[PDB]
C-alpha cells in the first residue's frame, strides 16, 4: 500500500517485579534493587580494620594485666572483639562505674603500658595471691602494685608524679577491702585504711570496708578499682594510710577511631568495612536490618527487613 | 501515571525491544521494522542512574558510640540509651519507607512522561499529512519507505514535500 | 495544576454530579443528559485511599519510656533527657509537615492528570470527525443520538462510520 | 440540530475546605481529613490495659509496704497511675537514685513479693516505731525488718541467701540514721554502724550519719534505701555492725510492657489502646498534640495542634 | 522536564524578554513584536516565593541545651551526649538534602507546566486556523494585525470570524 | 504577508546557575538562594539578648565569690559567655557533678545573692585565707562563711532556715580538708569532721579527708562544694561537727531562657538573634554550618556548607 502506520512503544521484560509508589502499595516494574542489607556474612573479616579477638578475656582484664591476659599487653586495635566464655581469673574486684572506663579504654585503642618509677619507702611490692596464678606462681595484676607493711609498720605514703608529656595520662589504682580485721592489720599496720588520689584541680578518697563476701577464687576480700586522669602540667599524687594498691605507670589516651564490641562469630580471612556482633557485613546499599550494633562504614540499621527501588519502567506485558 | 502514555493509550510494552527502552515499529511499503530511540532511551536512564545519590551522601565512617544491649538492669540512664537508640532508628525507617514511595513515584511518573515526549515529538513534525490512531499509532497518508521512516525518527522529515499527497490520500472524501 | 484542566480549561466543577468524580454532559438530538466516568474516578481513588499507608507503618506499640517531666531541677542528666525528647518532637513535627505538603501536591496533581486523561481519550477517539472548543467540550459534526454518546463513553465509538457525514458538515465552507 | 457536544467535567462541592501543598499555603479541596489528634477523651479507659489506680499511694511505697499501701501488695499492672496528692505515712526516707528504682519497677509491673527464711540469730526483729501505724499498732514498712540489739549486744551479722532460680531477684533494704548516739547506743551496741551487701561481682557498704534532720512524723531520724539485684547461681550476703534495715525476700523481675505515669484524670469504664496524663486518646489519626507522655498504640507527638491531607480535587464552584 | 517544553519543544529561552517569564513574539502585517503574559509569569511567581515556608516553621528560639565540646574524658555519660548530637545532626543534614531535591524538582516541573500551559491555552483558541509549527510556534492562516495579536494575548479571539480566510489559505491545495 | 506567526517563549538570563534535583545532580536554572549560613560575623553581638562577658571568672567562680569576680555579683544575663583564659584565684577548690551545678546557674540567669541570718552559736565566723586576697588582705569566698572554733571548742552546730517564700532557694555550701591532723584540731576541735546537710525529703553527708594534695596557691588543703535546693515549707538544717564552710544565703532560680557558652571571640556593638562560639550569625536562612553549639533564634546546623534552591526555572541560552 501507499501509505504507511508508524507505532510508538516501550520495552517490556517477561519476569518484572513489585515496587510501591505513593499512588500504590504494589505495581510492577521492569526491574528494581534492595535497598537493605538482610544478609550478614557469617564471619568478622579480618580486614580492612584491626580487628582482635578477646577469646578468654575481656578488654578490662587484659589491660589490668590478669595473667591469663599477659598476650593482650603491647597490643592495639581498631576493633576488640569480646566473648560471652571470657572469664576473669586473677584477685576478685569491682570498677564503679565499670562501663565508662571500659568505654575510655576502648575509645583509646591500645592497654600498652608506661612504666613509672613511683618509689614506695617503707612497705612491701610485689604482692602476690593463690587467686591469680601465673604459672605456678601466686601473683597479681601485672600493672598493679599491691603494697603491704616492711618489718611492724606502714607509714603514711605520699607520692608524686607530675605529667610532662604533651598528652593526658591515665592512671589505674586501687584499695583492698579486706575480710577480717586480723588480715587488715596482718598486711596493713593501721587498723582502718585510707587511699586519697589528687591532683590540681581533682581528687578521691576511698576508705576500705572490713568484711566477708562471697567467695571467689578463694577470697572473701576484694578490690575496688579507680581511676584518675592526669593533664599536662599537672601532677598524680597519692596519699595512703594502708590498702593501697598502687599504679605502677600510666596509659596514653589517643583520640581514636577505636571501639569494642560483644561478638561470639568467628574471625575470617576476608574483606569489608562494616562490622556487626552478626559478623561482618556488605557495605553497597543505604539501609540493613542486622543490628544495630555496628562499626565501621555502615549502611544504616532500619527496622524494615527489605524495600525495593524501581530502576525501570512500569512492566506492562501483553493483555 | 499521570501522562496516561504508559499501561494508557499506549496498550502495552514489547518484549521484542532489546535494543532500547522507547521506540518505534512500523509497517511501510519495505514491509515491517522496528528500531530503538537512543536519545529519550538515555534521558530515562540518567535520571535513573544514582538517583539515590542525589539524596544520601556516600555512607560515612562511624567508630566508637554507646552501647545498645545490656546485661543488667540500671534503671535512668539505661532507659535513656535505649530511648535515644528507638527514637533514632524509628526516624530512619520512616526515612527510608517515604524515600522509596518518592523516589519510585518520580521514577514512574518521568518514564510515562519520556514516552508522551516521543510521542508528541514524532506528531509534532508528522503535522497534518498523518493521524493519531488513538492507540500510540500514527496513518501517515503517504509512501513512506525506510528511508522516510528514518528520516522522522533523525528528526529531518519535511514535511512540506509530503503535504500534497497526502492531502490527496487523506481527502478522497465527502458524502 | 500541572495539567491545566480542572481549574483551568474546564472552567469549574459540577455540583450536580453526585454520580461519579469525572464525567460528561451533553446536548443533541434526544435533549440533554448527564453521565459519570467510572473508570477514572476509580483510578483516582484508589490512589488517595490509604494513602498515607504507604508512608507510615501502622502505629506502634510503646511502652516504658524515659520520663519528660520534672518536679526538680538537676543539671546534666536533666538536660539530655530534656534534650532528647525535644529533638525528637522537632524532627517528627517537620515530618509531619513536609508529609502533608507532599502527599497533598501529589493530590492535587494525580487528579488533574486523571480528569485531563479523559478529556485527551475522549478526543483521540473522535478523530478528525470533531473539535475542540477550548472549555473542555467536543463539537462533534454529526447527528449523535444517546446510543451514539454511549458509544464514546464506553470506548466503542467508530470514527470511519461517522466521517463521511462529519466531513460533510464540517467543510460547508471556503469564501 | 444534526451535531451534537459533549462536555467534559468534574465534580464540586457547596461547602469545600482549604489545604496546604509545595505550591499553595492554602487551596479549596472537595475534602480533607485532620491528621492530628488534638481532643483527649477526659478521662483514663479500663480497657485494654490493666490499669492500676495509685489512689493515696507512690509506687515505691506500695513496693516498700507502707500501711496505708497494703491494698497493692499481690497487685500488678501494665500502667499504675501515680495522683499528685499521694502521701508516705510511714518512716521517713530517702532513696539515692529513687528514679532508677521507680523505673526499675515500674517497668516490671508488679510488687508482688516473695519472702525468704532469713535467719538473723542474736538480734531483735520486727522493730516498729509510731511514724508508721498500722491500726491503732506502732508498724514498718511491710518489707522490711527492722533489726535491734537483743539482751546487751547485737554481732557481727554474716546472712546468705543463694538464688537457685531461673531470674534476678531483686532486693531491697536499708540503713538507719539516728538522730543520737544516745539513740544508736540503744539500739544497735556498736556506736558507728555498717552494713555491706554484696554478690560475687558487685558491693555496696553504708555507713550511717548520726544526727538531727527536720522531724517528720515525729522523727528526726532517717532511712535510707539501696538496692542489689542477684543473678542466677550467684549469692546475697549481707554483713552488718548496727544499724541494718533488712530485708524479708525478693521481688521477681520481669521483662515487661509495664510503666507508670503521673496524672490526675478519673479512670472510667471505656475502651482505648493509648495513654496520656490528659486521659486515653483515640488512635485512629498518625499525630497527636495532646501530650509527649504517652503509654500504649500511640499517634506521634507534634506540635502542631491540626494537618489537613486532602481526600478529594481541587473544590471549583461555579464563577 | 516532564512536559519536554523548556528545553525541548521550545528550542531555547529568549535574553531579551526582561518584561516577564512567559510570553510572545510574533511577525505579521505591522512587522515583529514581543509581549510578556502576566497571568502564567505570576503563576510560576506565586508558587515559588515563600516555597520553604510552607515546609519549615518560622525558626525558633532555643535556649539552655546540652553542652557539645569536652575537655575531659569521661565515658557513659558524654558518650551519650556526643551521640545524641550526631544522631540529630545527621538527620537534618539528610532533610536539608531531600528538601532542596524535592524542591526543585518540583520548581523545575512547574515551570515547564507553565510554559506548556500556555501554549495549550493559546492553541486552543486558534482552533483550526492555526498550525502547531513543532518548535513552540504557531503558523496562523491570515492577516492577523497587532489588533488580533493582542485579541490571542488576552484570549478574546473569536476564530469564525477568520475561518473562512484561513480555510481559503490553508486549502490552497491538492496535487 | 497576509498569514502570520505567533511564538510562544520563555526567559533567560546570560549567567545562570548550578542545581541539584531528583533527576539531575546538577542542572542550569535562571536563580537560586543558599539555604545554608556559612559565614560568621566574627564578633558577639551585644543585642538584642543580654550578654555578659566573664572575662577572667568563670560562672562558677562568679557566683562563689571568687574577690577577682566581685564585679559580677548583681549580674544577671540572658547568655553568659567564659574565656578560656579565666581563672581562679581564692581557695583552691572541687565541686562533685560541676557541670550539673554550672547548668543549674547558667540556665538560672544570675548570681544574685539574698543574705540570711544564720546565727552560728560558738564558733568563728570569718575565716579568711592568703590563697584568696581581697585588696591586701586574706579574705575568702564571699557568698561562703568559713567556720572554726572560737577558744578552745567547736560544738555541734544544729542550724535551720526555713523556707517561706514562693521559690525554690539554693544554697550553696562545702566542707574544708585539711592538710595535717595539726591544722584540723587547731582550726576544728574534734579530730574528724563532719557536716550534714538536710531537708524533710533529701539529706546528704560528707567527712573530711585528712593529707596533702598538690600545692595550688600555697595551699595542700582543698574545699569541696555541694548544694542542696529547699522547697517552699520545706526547711534546710545543717548539722556539723568540724569543718563546715558553710552557706551565707541563697540563690533564686529562675525558669529562665538563660545559658552559658564558651568563646573567645570579642563583643561588639551590632544587633542579631542567634550567637555561636564563632560569633553571631544571621538568622534568614533555614541551615547553618559554623557551629553546631549555638543561642537563639537559630537555623538548624547541618554538616553541608551549601544548599541551592532554585527560585527560577531551567535556563537554556542560545544553543
Ligand atoms: C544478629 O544477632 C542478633 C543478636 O545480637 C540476633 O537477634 C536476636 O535473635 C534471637 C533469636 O534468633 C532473639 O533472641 C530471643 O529473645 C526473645 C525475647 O527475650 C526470647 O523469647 C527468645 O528465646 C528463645 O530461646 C529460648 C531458650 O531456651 C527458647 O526456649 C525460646 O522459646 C522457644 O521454645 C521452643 C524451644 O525450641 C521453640 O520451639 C518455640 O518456637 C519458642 O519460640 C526461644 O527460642 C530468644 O532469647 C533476639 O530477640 C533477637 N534480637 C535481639 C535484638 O537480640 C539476630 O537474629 C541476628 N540477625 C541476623 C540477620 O542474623
Ligand atoms: C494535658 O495536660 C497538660 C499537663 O500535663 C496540659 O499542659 C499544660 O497546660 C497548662 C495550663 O493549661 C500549662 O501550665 C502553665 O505553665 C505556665 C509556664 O510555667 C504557667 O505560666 C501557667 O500558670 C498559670 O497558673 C497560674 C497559677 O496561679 C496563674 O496565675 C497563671 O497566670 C494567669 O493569671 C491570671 C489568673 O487567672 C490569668 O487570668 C492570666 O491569663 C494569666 O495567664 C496561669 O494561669 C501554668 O502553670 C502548661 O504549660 C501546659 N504544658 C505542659 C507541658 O505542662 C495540657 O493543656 C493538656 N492538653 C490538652 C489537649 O488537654
Ligand atoms: C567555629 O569555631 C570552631 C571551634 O569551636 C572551629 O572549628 C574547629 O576548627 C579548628 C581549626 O580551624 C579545628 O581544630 C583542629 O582539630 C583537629 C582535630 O583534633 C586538629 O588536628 C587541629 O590541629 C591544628 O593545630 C595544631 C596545633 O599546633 C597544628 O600543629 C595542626 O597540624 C598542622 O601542622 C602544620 C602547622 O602549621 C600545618 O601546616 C598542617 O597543615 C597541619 O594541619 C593543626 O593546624 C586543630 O586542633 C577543629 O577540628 C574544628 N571543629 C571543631 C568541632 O572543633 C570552626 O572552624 C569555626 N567555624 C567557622 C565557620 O568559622
Ligand atoms: C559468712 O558466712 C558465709 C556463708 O557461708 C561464709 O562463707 C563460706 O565460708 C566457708 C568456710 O570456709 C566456705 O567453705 C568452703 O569452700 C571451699 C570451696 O567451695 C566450693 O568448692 C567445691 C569444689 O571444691 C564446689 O563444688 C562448691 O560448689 C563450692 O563452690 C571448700 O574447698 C572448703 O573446704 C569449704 O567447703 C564457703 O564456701 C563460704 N561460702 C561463701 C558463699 O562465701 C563466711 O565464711 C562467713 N564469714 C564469717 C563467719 O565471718
Ligand atoms: C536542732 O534544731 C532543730 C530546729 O529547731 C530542732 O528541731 C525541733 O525540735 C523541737 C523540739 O522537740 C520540735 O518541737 C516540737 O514539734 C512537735 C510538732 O510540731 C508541729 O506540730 C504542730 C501541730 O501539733 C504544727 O502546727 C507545727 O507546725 C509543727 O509542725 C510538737 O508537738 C512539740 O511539742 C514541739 O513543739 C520542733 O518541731 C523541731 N523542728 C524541726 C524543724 O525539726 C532539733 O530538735 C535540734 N536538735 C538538737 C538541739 O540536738
Ligand atoms: C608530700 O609530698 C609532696 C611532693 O613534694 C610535698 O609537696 C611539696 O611541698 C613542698 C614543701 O613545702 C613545696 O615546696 C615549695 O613550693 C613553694 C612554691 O613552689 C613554686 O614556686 C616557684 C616560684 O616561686 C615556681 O617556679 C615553682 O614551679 C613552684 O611551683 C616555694 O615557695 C617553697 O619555698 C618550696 O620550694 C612543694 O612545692 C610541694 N609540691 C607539691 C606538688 O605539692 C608535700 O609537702 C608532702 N607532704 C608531706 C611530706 O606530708
Ligand atoms: C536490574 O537492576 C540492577 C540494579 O539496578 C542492575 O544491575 C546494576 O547495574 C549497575 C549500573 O547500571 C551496576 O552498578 C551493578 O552491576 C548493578 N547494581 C546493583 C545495585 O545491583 C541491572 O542492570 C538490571 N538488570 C537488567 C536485566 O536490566
Ligand atoms: C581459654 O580457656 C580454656 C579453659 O581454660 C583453655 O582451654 C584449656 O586448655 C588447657 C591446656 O591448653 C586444657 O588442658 C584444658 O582442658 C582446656 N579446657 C577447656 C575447657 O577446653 C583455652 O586454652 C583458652 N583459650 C585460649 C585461646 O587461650
Ligand atoms: C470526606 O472525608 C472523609 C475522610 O476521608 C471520608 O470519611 C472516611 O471514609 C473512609 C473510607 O472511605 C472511612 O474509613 C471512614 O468512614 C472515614 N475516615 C475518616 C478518617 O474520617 C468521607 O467519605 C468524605 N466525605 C464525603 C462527603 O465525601
Ligand atoms: C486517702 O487519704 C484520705 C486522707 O487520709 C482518706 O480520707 C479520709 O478518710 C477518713 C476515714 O475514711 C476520714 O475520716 C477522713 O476525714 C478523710 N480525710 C479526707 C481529707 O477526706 C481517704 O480514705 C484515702 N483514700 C483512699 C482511696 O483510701
Ligand atoms: C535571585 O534570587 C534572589 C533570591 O530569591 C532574589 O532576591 C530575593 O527577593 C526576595 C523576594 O522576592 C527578597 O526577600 C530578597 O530581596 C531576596 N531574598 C533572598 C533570600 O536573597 C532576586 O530577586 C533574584 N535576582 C534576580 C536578578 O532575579
Ligand atoms: C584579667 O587578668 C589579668 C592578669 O591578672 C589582668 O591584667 C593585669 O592587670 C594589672 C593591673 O591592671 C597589671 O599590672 C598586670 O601586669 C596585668 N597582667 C597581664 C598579664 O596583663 C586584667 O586586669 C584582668 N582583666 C580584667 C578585664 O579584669
Ligand atoms: C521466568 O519465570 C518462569 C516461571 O517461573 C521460568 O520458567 C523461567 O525460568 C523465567 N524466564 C525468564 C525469561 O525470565
Ligand atoms: C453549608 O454552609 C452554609 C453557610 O454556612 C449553611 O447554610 C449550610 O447549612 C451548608 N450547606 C451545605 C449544602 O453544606
Ligand atoms: C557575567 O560573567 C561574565 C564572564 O565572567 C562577565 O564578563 C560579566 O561581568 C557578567 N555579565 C553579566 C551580564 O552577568
Excluded at chain 1, 583492698?176 to 596482718?186: G, I, L
Amino acid at each position: 500500500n501507499n501509505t504507511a502506520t508508524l507505532c510508538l512503544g516501550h520495552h517490556a521484560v517477561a519476569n518484572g517485579t513489585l515496587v510501591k509508589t505513593m499512588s500504590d502499595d504494589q505495581i510492577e516494574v521492569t526491574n528494581a534493587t534492595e535497598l537493605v542489607q538482610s544478609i550478614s556474612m557469617g564471619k568478622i573479616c579480618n580486614k580492612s580494620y584491626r580487628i582482635l579477638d578477646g577469646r578468654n578475656c575481656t578488654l578490662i582484664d587484659a589491660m589490668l594485666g590478669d595473667p591469663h591476659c599477659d598476650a593482650f599487653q603491647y597490643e592495639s586495635w581498631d576493633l576488640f572483639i569480646e566473648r560471652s566464655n571470657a572469664f576473669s581469673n586473677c584477685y576478685p574486684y569491682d570498677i564503679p562505674d565499670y562501663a565508662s572506663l571500659r568505654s575510655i579504654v576502648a575509645s583509646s585503642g591500645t592497654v600498652e603500658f608506661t612504666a613509672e618509677g613511683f618509689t614506695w619507702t617503707g612497705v612491701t611490692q610485689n604482692g602476690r595471691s593463690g587467686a591469680c596464678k601465673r604459672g605456678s606462681a601466686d601473683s597479681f595484676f601485672s600493672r598493679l602494685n599491691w603494697l603491704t607493711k616492711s618489718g611492724s609498720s606502714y607509714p603514711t605514703l605520699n607520692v608524686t608524679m607530675p605529667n610532662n608529656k604533651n598528652f593526658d595520662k591515665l592512671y589505674i589504682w586501687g584499695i583492698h577491702h579486706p575480710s577480717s580485721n586480723q588480715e587488715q592489720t596482718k598486711l596493713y599496720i593501721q587498723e582502718s585504711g585510707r587511699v586519697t588520689v589528687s591532683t590540681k584541680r581533682s581528687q578521691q578518697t576511698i576508705i576500705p570496708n572490713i568484711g566477708s563476701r562471697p567467695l571467689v577464687r578463694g577470697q572473701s576480700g576484694r578490690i575496688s578499682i579507680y581511676w584518675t586522669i592526669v593533664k599536662p602540667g599537672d601532677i598524680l599524687m597519692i596519699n595512703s594510710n594502708g590498702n593501697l594498691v598502687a599504679p605502677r605507670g600510666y596509659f596514653k589516651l589517643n583520640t581514636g577511631k577505636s571501639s569494642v564490641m560483644r561478638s561470639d562469630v568467628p574471625i575470617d580471612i576476608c574483606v569489608s568495612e562494616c562490622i556487626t556482633p552478626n559478623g561482618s557485613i556488605s557495605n553497597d546499599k543505604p539501609f540493613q536490618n542486622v543490628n544495630k550494633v555496628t562499626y565501621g562504614k555502615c549502611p544504616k540499621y532500619i527496622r524494615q527487613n527489605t524495600l525495593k527501588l524501581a530502576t525501570g519502567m512500569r512492566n506492562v506485558p501483553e493483555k | 501515571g499521570i501522562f496516561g502514555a504508559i499501561a494508557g493509550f499506549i496498550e502495552n510494552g514489547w518484549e521484542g525491544m532489546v535494543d532500547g527502552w522507547y521506540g518505534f515499529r512500523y509497517q511501510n511499503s519495505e514491509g515491517t521494522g522496528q528500531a530503538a530511540d537512543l536519545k529519550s532511551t538515555q534521558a530515562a536512564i540518567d535520571q535513573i542512574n544514582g538517583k539515590l545519590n542525589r539524596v544520601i551522601e556516600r555512607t560515612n565512617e562511624k567508630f566508637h558510640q554507646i552501647e545498645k544491649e545490656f546485661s543488667e538492669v540500671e534503671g535512668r540512664i539505661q532507659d535513656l540509651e535505649k530511648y535515644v537508640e528507638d527514637t533514632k532508628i524509628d526516624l530512619w525507617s520512616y526515612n527510608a519507607e517515604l524515600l522509596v514511595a518518592l523516589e519510585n513515584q518520580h521514577t514512574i511518573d518521568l518514564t510515562d512522561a519520556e514516552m508522551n515526549k516521543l510521542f508528541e515529538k514524532t506528531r509534532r513534525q508528522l503535522r497534518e499529512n498523518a493521524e493519531d490512531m488513538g492507540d500510540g499509532c500514527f496513518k501517515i497518508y503517504h509512501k513512506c519507505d525506510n528511508a522516510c521512516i528514518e528520516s522522522i525518527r533523525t528528526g529531518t522529515y519535511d514535511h512540506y514535500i509530503y503535504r500534497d499527497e497526502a492531502l490527496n490520500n487523506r481527502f478522497q472524501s465527502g458524502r
